[PDB]
């Protein structure tokens, strides 16, 4: 790609056979996917921004596919209104912003 | 500019003889500034984040120079973690997500 900002940057990801939609967030520190039953160990954590903080569970080394590009990283599950692909993984598929 | 994601995409914004550090957040619909006085009649708005909704005070048509590229538009002032340049001003200046 080269995604356009006219419309939000929604894309599609693979997570454990979950084909899903995500917002490429150059403004997200982390990756927060809504409610999903990942396999494993986690540790609560807190994140916030406009609004305040909300609690999410953090999973280590989880494999993911951002539009035919593998990447594996930390992924937070929790009460988000949009699965969001933060920079952590963003940095693994070669995303840049250009103007 | 080709800006990588290994660090937050923070660039200097020139907003009417005022300079600030803002964040190129492609997950943001709008441009939200930390409390500030702008010339103009505002109207109160409520926008949302991961934490919930915040009441903001909005200014229409306002020029901003995003690292020496000019945008002219809505700019909301409020209680944010930081300055975010959203897809409102972000597409005026022609930013794209490449990967």
């Amino acid at each position: 790609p080269q995604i356009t900002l006219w419309q939000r940057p929604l894309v599609t990801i693979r997570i454990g056979g979950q084909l899903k939609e995500a917002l490429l967030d150059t403004g997200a520190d982390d990756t927060v996917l809504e409610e999903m039953n990942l396999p494993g160990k986690w540790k609560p954590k807190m994140i916030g921004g406009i609004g305040g903080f909300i609690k999410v569970r953090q999973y280590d080394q989880i494999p993911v596919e951002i539009a035919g590009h593998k990447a594996i990283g930390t992924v937070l599950v929790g009460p988000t209104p949009v699965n969001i692909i933060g920079r952590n993984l963003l940095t693994q598929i070669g995303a840049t912003l250009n103007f | 500019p080709q800006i990588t994601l290994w660090q937050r995409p923070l660039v200097t914004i020139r907003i009417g003889g005022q300079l600030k550090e803002a964040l190129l957040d492609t997950g943001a619909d709008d441009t939200v500034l930390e409390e500030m006085n702008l010339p103009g009649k505002w109207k109160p708005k409520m926008i949302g984040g991961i934490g919930g909704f915040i009441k903001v005070r909005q200014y229409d048509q306002i020029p901003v120079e995003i690292a020496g590229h000019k945008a002219i538009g809505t700019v909301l002032v409020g209680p944010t973690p930081v300055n975010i340049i959203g897809r409102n001003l972000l597409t005026q200046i022609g930013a794209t997500l490449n990967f």
Binding site: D25, I47, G49, V82, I84 | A28, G49, V82
Partner: peptide
Amino acid sequence: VSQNXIV
């Protein structure tokens, strides 16, 4: 009805 994204 406008949303804005994480620290």
